[PDB]
Structure formats: C-alpha cells, structure tokens
Design a protein around this ligand. Structure first.
Ligand SMILES: O=C(COc1ccc(Cl)cc1C(=O)c1ccccc1)Nc1ccccc1
Lengths: 535, 403
C-alpha cells in the first residue's frame, strides 16, 4: 500500500529538462514478463498508464535473479534531478552504540514503493514497454511513488520515515531507533516481554502508514552483520577476514592483497606489508605474475596467523571515563586504543608514516592526539582523557616555545616506552670555547656545479666541489661538513634561509636525505649553536 | 509586518557548508534552544529537498549556566546582495566604548519567503545514530549580513531619541553589536549606558589608550660578533619598511672569522649608523593611509611565553596598526585559547576604527584551530581567516617592540 504521507517537492536542476533516452529493444519473452509486472504494479497504484503527452522517457530492462524482474535505468533522470541533503553519509561506528538489553531490526525494503512521489515530478519518470519487434507503439507508464534507483529516493524515504517515527519516539524516549537504509534497528533496556510488545506497537504503528511488515523468513536476528561487523549482545567483532592462498600471484592480486592488509593494520596489531609491496617494483602489467620472495612469503604467512586471532570491541557506557592511550610504533607511526574499562577496548587504530618536508615527534604526537579527539567527538560527543608516552616536562618545554599554536587536551603521562622526546635542542646563545664555523655554499644552478665549505675561527678550512647539485644542497652541505668536522660543541654561522627554518622549528625528520643527514649530526653533538646572517 | 525581497548576488548559489562535529553538551543545548525557537515560530523544520547548509554551534560569553547559539553565516553573507551602516571616525576618539548585543531585535521581522531556504542549518547527532535536525529561518537570523541592514530603519527610529537626548555620544552598529562611545567619567558612562539598555529593553573599551608602539633596537655595554649579526639581520629585514635603515658600517665589524663570542668595539661610524637607525624607528613609516576599497589584513605571530604580536595592514609593510597581546590569566597551558582571545581583541579594535573585520593569517594548523576555537569564542560575529607559516624574521622584528 502507498503511505498517506505528504509528498516532497522535487525539481530538475537549474533549467534542465526531463530525460528522453530511448527504450532499448527487447525480445517477446522479456516484454511479456514486464507487462505482467507492470500490470500488477499499476493495480497497486505504484505506476500509471499515461499517454501522448509526456515527451520524456527512460530505458526499462529485464534481469533474472529465477523469474523475470524489472530494472529501470534512471541514470539520465538522475543527472537532471535536483540535489538533496546528504542521505546521511556519516558512517556510525560500533564503538559508539550504547549497550541495550534488546535490539530488534525491522525490515522496510519495498518501503521505497510505499512512499508517494511529488505528483509534479512524476512525468519525468515516464518509461515504455516495447512491442514485439518495433511494431506498433509500446505501453507507457509513469511512477506514482519513489522509484528504486532514482537520485531522490533514499533521501525522501529517510525523511519520510523520520516524520512517521517522531510520534513513537516522543511516546517512548527510553527507546532508541537507528535508521539505516531499508532497516530500522530498535533497541531498549526494557524487559524482553515489554520490548517485544513495543516492537509490535511500533510495527503496528508503521502499518498504519502503509509501511508493511516483513515475514518471519525475512526476519533477521543477532548477531547482526552490519557494514562489515558482527554485533553481539555484549560485544562486537570484526567479520572473519580471509586471505587467498595461491601458488601464483599477479600484480593485481598483490595490490588487492596489500589493500586488504593495510585495512586490517587498524584492528590488528602487527600486520606488515613492506615485503609484499616490494613485489610491485617495475611491474609492467596488472596481470603480470610476480613470484613471492622468501620474505614476502614469511610475511604473508605471519599475517594469516594474526587475522586468525579474535579481536572484539565493547559498547559505550555513558557513565564511565573515556580513555585514550597512544604509542609511537616507529618514526611517524602511532598506535592508539580508546577504552573505558582496562583491556576492553571500544576502538583501536594507527596513523601511517606520512613522509613530508619536515616536522618533529612532539608535533606528530600532537597531531595524532588531534585526529583522535575529532574522532571521539564524532563517535561519543566528548573528548577522552589522554595517556601519552611523553613527560609533562618535555611537553611544556616544546610547546611553550614553538612558533605555532598547538595544544593537547587533558592528558597524563604513561611510561610505556618508547617515550617521545626532543632529539636535540639548539643552544639559546653562542657557545664559548666552541669552534665557530663560517659555512657557505654556492652552485651554478644551470651547470649544477658548485662548492661547499667553511672556515673556522681556529683556522680550520675545507671546500668540496659538488657535481650535479643545487644552491640549496651546497648550503646544507656546507653545514653538514661543519657538523661532521667539528667537536661535540659547535657554533655555526650561515646565510642559508633554509637553516633559519631549522632554527625556528628544529625538525627531527624530513623528506630530504641531506637535511636528514644534518639532523643525525645535530642529534649527535652535545651542544650546537646555529646563527643566521643575511647574504 | 511585510518582507523585503532579498537575493543572492548575481550568479551566486546558496551556501552548502558542512557542519563540524559538536560535543554532546553542545548538541543538547542547540536542541533545547531550537525547539523553543520553533515554538515561537522563528525557525521551521525543512525537507531533504533543501541542499543548502550553514554551520551552527553553541557558545557562552557573559552568562554562566546559559548557552547561546552561534550560526556561522560568513559564506551566506559573502553571497548575499549588497545594500548598510555609516561609520563614525569619532568612535575611536572616545574615552570609553561598550558593546551591546542587539541580536534579538531581528526576531521581530519576517524574512522573505523565497530567501529563507538559504538559511538552512543542521544540528548534528552523536555517531550519526540519528539524522540531523534541519531548520531554516522565518525571521531575520542573527549574524546574517542582511539583518542589520533590513532592520536599519527600525534601529535609527528607536535610537534617535537617545541620540538626540545625547548628541555627545556616538553609537555604531556592526552586525548584532552596538558600540556605544562617550567621554563621560567611568561611573557616569556606565550609568548612561543602562539608560540605553532600558530604552532597548522595551521593544568596556578605551580606544584613546590604544597606543601605537614603536620598535626599539637593543642597547648594550659590549657587543659580540653574535649580537651584531643579530641586530644586522633584523635591521636588514626592517629596511623593507624603512629604506633609510643601513647596516654597512655595522656589517664591516663582521669582516673576519672571529669567535661568535668575541667582543667587537664599535667604531664611531657603526655608532652613528646605529643612532640614525634608532631615530628612523622612533615613528611609524610615513604615507600609510587606510583605503576603504581594499581588505584589512591582520597577521599574528606567536612570540612565546604567552606573548603574541600582530600587524593590521592592507599593503605589505605599510602597517595601519601594530601591537602585542599577552595571554590572559588562566590560559597558561592553552595556545588555542590565547589565539582566539587575540583574534576577538584585534577584530573588535578593527571594527571600532574602520567598521569592518580584518582577514587573519593565523599561526596555527587548520585542524588544530577548527577543532577548538568555538570553545573560547564569545563574539556574535566571526572574522575570515587563513593559516600560515610565520617567517622567522617577522617575529624577530616585532619582538623588538617597546614596552
Ligand atoms: O547492546 C547493543 C548495542 O548496540 C545497539 C544499540 C541500539 C540499537 Cl538501536 C542498535 C544496536 C546495535 O547493536 C546495532 C545493530 C545493527 C546495526 C547497527 C547497530 N546491541 C545488541 C543488543 C542485543 C543483541 C545484539 C546487539
């Protein structure tokens, strides 16, 4: 039946007109099957036989799933239909659901055809049922309800369901309802018998609005498979993740693999793909066969064991602290788990090593904290208490003097090495008794021929000729040479604008192999003072 | 009361800005606030056929237990046709200026039927276990550029009596705010304000103090190679502002590869040069004037230890105003909190003086800023902003400002 709900006023994009694509030709079989279908629909009030009027049209098809089924191709009408508010594309996360004594899912599939269509837009949904060959004229119809496959259907149906549920939600607020696609997940902490009664009241309420009730066969039950998870009464889990075992792997095979494994590195502690990813070097085709090395074999072998391990999360309890602990897995790599009760994690994850220009550990930690804060606010509507592997002293020393605004919400220190710290701290004033290197670097930016060197107050000097370099590189090398030729305490004078950058941020990681060599030297000294002077 | 036809600028389509995640505490508040506005007929729930969106959130400025709703119409404002309010140069010239939030005055005027949709906004939900609660306005919305303009005739009318009764006081309106300035003694000033409040209820700045602090080069007993190298670096850069600034004689005291710690006796020439450079920096660079046809820019540098420097200008190096801000009591461990107060402080000064907000260059990462700024925001308005990388020298230079 069709819901006695008010229609939503739809329109075609700015000025555009209804689609006019022509009906694909079909056989006498498929045509007779469609006529059958469309007659059953016309009767239910879903569609309407129309006439000469309508200049618009859409291609109707016939697929077999094993009786014949209709399939209207609304791509063109969809390109011409107005835009609607996102049909809610923000994917919830299990870790965010509050535990409920009972959850019941209600199916409202063909509900799409249960909601009427703006009778003003209906004309644009005109389609045609062909005649045998291309003989006489075909039968013509129009939709009186939300067509499956049309741009506005999911949004309008959601909107519609929402209005219809407002009364029920008002009456019993101790009940939670989640609208997802064609499903309604109804949860509550009532007693099973009372719960069951409310479901029936609701189910009964929806019936009133032409939104039919599923069968017991179409009736799904716990655990619930949702967007890839398995939600159980007391905990949630990840659906079993399987890896294809073979004695032949194509480029495409290895890339898909790497894909699934990279995905899993989130929930699973230990997934590694370095050796497998190496197999993609110099590949010449998606179907090329690359023999897995020994290491790629050892790796792909170890991951299989990991994925066989049981990893589950817990649900959200609004009355317990929200906690987040972070670990530095390696340079530029972090792991985090958010939990309330120790050992029972709500969620976990990791942020990959993003090879870039130049930054430092405290900064990257700071960014991992931020991404997590935004994540929690989205999932739980509040930010967690942080347990970070860095001393309050280290933090206060770094943040207080850094050139950029930065901040970490309420946190605590947890001594779970490795600890994050400053690899070096340039001196605040020149070092007395430490040699002073006056470094300089020049290079013909065209011939890429240059020299790099220094002269110290102690009379020590050097100059290296570099083949195929840049201005920057000679400047930086001038400094590098100074660092490696000097003692554990150095004063370094340079006119390199870049260095001025190092002074301000004092990075401990960069993308430049050179800056990185300099960072290692910097870290090695006991004291180093870098002074910039205009060129 | 009727509705004047309001439109988007030629070719502009409405805003479609996404709602940033809100905390549960804030969502609950907007829900309450909005339910009550719905009852009073100020806003109405909308359908999915409305694709527009403007971000909304909740703040707390003066009152404690109370939550205020703040809608970010910057985008809609940029796309709203042009009309406005006249700016009085006398404002800045007042001993005291107090700001008053006259945002409620708009809840009385209906908003054009056809323009309403462009005001769509959404209350988010936790974990998306619920569709957003969509709304659009029926009445002039707070924070919208067209509100004060349309309620313009009604503001002069209700303000005229007070302006006539007191022709020695200047009243300026920007957005939801009303900046009231006079010279009266503190007590008499405040008492004179409530007179306006009461009048309004039936329908503490000090610009003169705002100094224009100069640069002061360091003076020293003895100068080291390092000291000279540093003075020279700043002077050099500063010559981008003042061309009479020179470092020739000073730079000469650097010829040689001496220890960074060695003391260098200043020649008399290096001294006169230093003396000439000091004089030059005793006053702002001549010829810098405010140009209405151009945008005002506010650049901020994090100096450290709770200190921040800023410069308002329109052309590089031609500062209309420069200054410093020291983190207020309690922001000790929060950069983001100090930065937001500075923006509010710099924006308010800006409004007072030229009647418009400047565009900011913020020394903070976008993600950092957007995640927390509303936590400390208290103004009814919102300036424009972009995020930048503070040049090492610009900070070093303005660090030299006099105290
Ligand atoms: O205790 C909880 C907590 O989760 C929920 C709380 C409220 C609602 Cl309406 C749905 C859920 C879901 O599990 C869910 C199922 C499917 C999709 C998306 C969410 N679950 C549970 C209880 C008994 C049995 C099984 C699970």
């Amino acid at each position: 039946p069709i819901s006695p709900i008010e229609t939503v006023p739809v329109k075609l994009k700015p000025g555009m007109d209804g689609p006019k694509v022509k009906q694909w030709p079909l056989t006498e079989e498929k045509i007779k099957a469609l006529v059958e279908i469309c007659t059953e629909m016309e009767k239910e009030g879903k569609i309407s036989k129309i006439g000469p009027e309508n200049p618009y049209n859409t291609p109707v098809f016939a697929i077999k799933k094993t009786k014949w089924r209709k399939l209207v191709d609304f791509r063109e009408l969809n390109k011409r239909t107005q835009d609607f508010w996102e049909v809610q594309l923000g994917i919830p996360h299990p870790a965010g659901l509050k535990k409920k004594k009972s959850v019941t899912v209600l199916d409202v599939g063909d509900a799409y055809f249960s909601v009427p269509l703006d009778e003003d837009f209906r004309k644009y949904t005109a389609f045609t049922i062909p005649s045998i060959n291309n003989e006489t004229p075909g039968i013509r119809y129009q939709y009186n309800v939300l067509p499956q496959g049309w741009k506005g259907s999911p949004a309008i149906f959601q909107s519609s369901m929402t209005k219809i549920l407002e009364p029920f939600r008002k009456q019993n607020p101790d009940i939670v309802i989640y609208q997802y696609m064609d499903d309604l997940y109804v949860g509550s902490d009532l007693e099973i018998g009372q719960h069951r009664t409310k479901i029936e009241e609701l189910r009964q309420h929806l019936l009133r609005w032409g939104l039919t009730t599923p069968d017991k066969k179409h009736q799904k039950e716990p655990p619930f498979l949702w967007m890839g998870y398995e939600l159980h009464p007391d905990k949630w889990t990840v659906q079993p993740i399987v890896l294809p075992e073979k004695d032949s792997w194509t480029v495409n095979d290895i890339q898909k693999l790497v894909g699934k494994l990279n995905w899993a590195s989130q929930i699973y502690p230990g997934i590694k793909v370095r050796q497998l990813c190496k197999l993609l070097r110099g590949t010449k085709a998606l179907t090329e066969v690359i023999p897995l090395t020994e290491e790629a074999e050892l790796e792909l072998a170890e991951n299989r064991e990991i994925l066989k391990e049981p990893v589950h999360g817990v649900y959200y309890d609004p009355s317990k602290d929200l906690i987040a602990e972070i670990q530095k897995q390696g340079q530029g790599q972090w792991t985090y788990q958010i939990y309330q009760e120790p050992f029972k994690n709500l969620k976990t994850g990791k942020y990959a090593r993003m090879r870039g220009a130049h930054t430092n550990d405290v900064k990257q930690l700071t960014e991992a904290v931020q991404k997590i804060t935004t994540e929690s606010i989205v999932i739980w509507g509040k930010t967690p208490k942080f347990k970070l592997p860095i001393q309050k002293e280290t933090w206060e020393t770094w943040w207080t003097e850094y050139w950029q605004a930065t901040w970490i919400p309420e946190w605590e220190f947890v001594n779970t090495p490795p600890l994050v710290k400053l690899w070096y701290q340039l001196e605040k004033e020149p070092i007395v008794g430490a040699e002073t290197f006056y470094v300089d670097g020049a290079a013909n930016r065209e011939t890429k021929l240059g020299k790099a060197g220094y002269v110290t107050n102690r009379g020590r000097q050097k100059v290296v000729t570099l083949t195929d370099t840049t201005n920057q590189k000679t400047e930086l090398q001038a400094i590098y040479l100074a660092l490696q030729d000097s003692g554990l305490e150095v004063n370094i004078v340079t006119d390199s604008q870049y260095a001025l950058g190092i002074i301000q941020a004092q990075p401990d990681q960069s993308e430049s192999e050179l800056v990185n060599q300099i960072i290692e030297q910097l870290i090695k000294k006991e004291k180093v003072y870098l002074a910039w002077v205009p060129a | 009361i009727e509705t004047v036809p309001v439109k988007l600028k030629p070719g502009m389509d409405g805003p479609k800005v996404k709602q940033w995640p809100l905390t549960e505490e804030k969502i609950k508040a907007l829900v309450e606030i909005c339910t009550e506005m719905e009852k009073e007929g100020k806003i109405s729930k909308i359908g999915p056929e409305n694709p527009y969106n403007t971000p909304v959130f909740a703040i707390k400025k003066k009152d404690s237990t109370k939550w205020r709703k703040l809608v970010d119409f910057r985008e809609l404002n940029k796309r709203t046709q042009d009309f406005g309010i006249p700016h009085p140069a006398g404002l800045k010239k007042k001993k005291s200026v107090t700001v008053l939030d006259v945002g409620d005055a708009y809840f009385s005027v209906p908003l054009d039927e056809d323009f309403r949709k462009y005001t769509a906004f959404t209350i988010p939900s936790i974990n998306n276990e619920t569709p957003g609660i969509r709304y659009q306005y029926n009445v002039l919305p707070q924070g919208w550029k067209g509100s004060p303009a349309i309620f313009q005739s009604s503001m002069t009318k209700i303000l005229e009596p007070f302006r006539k009764q007191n022709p020695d006081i200047v009243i300026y309106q920007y957005m939801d705010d009303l900046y009231v300035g006079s010279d009266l003694e503190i007590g008499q000033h405040r008492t004179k304000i409530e007179e306006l409040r009461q009048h309004l209820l039936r329908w503490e700045l000090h610009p003169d103090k705002w100094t224009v602090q100069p640069i002061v080069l360091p003076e020293k007993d003895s100068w080291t190679v390092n000291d000279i190298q540093k003075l020279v670096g700043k002077l050099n850069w500063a010559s981008q502002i003042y061309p009479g600034i020179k470092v020739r004689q000073l730079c000469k005291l650097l010829r040689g590869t001496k220890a960074l710690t060695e003391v260098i006796p200043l020649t008399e020439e290096a001294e006169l040069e230093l003396a000439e450079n000091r004089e030059i920096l005793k006053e702002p660079v001549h010829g810098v004037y405010y140009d209405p046809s151009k945008d005002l820019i506010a650049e901020i540098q994090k100096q450290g230890q709770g200190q921040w420097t800023y410069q308002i200008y329109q052309e590089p190096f031609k500062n209309l105003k420069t200054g410093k801000y020291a983190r207020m009591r309690g922001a000790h461990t929060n950069d983001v909190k100090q930065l937001t107060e500075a923006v509010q402080k710099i924006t308010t000064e800006s409004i007072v003086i030229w009647g418009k907000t400047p565009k900011f260059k913020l020394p903070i990462q976008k993600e950092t800023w957007e995640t927390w700024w509303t936590e400390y925001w208290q103004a009814t308005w919102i300036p424009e902003w972009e995020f930048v990388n503070t040049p090492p020298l610009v900070k070093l230079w303005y660090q030299l400002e006099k105290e």
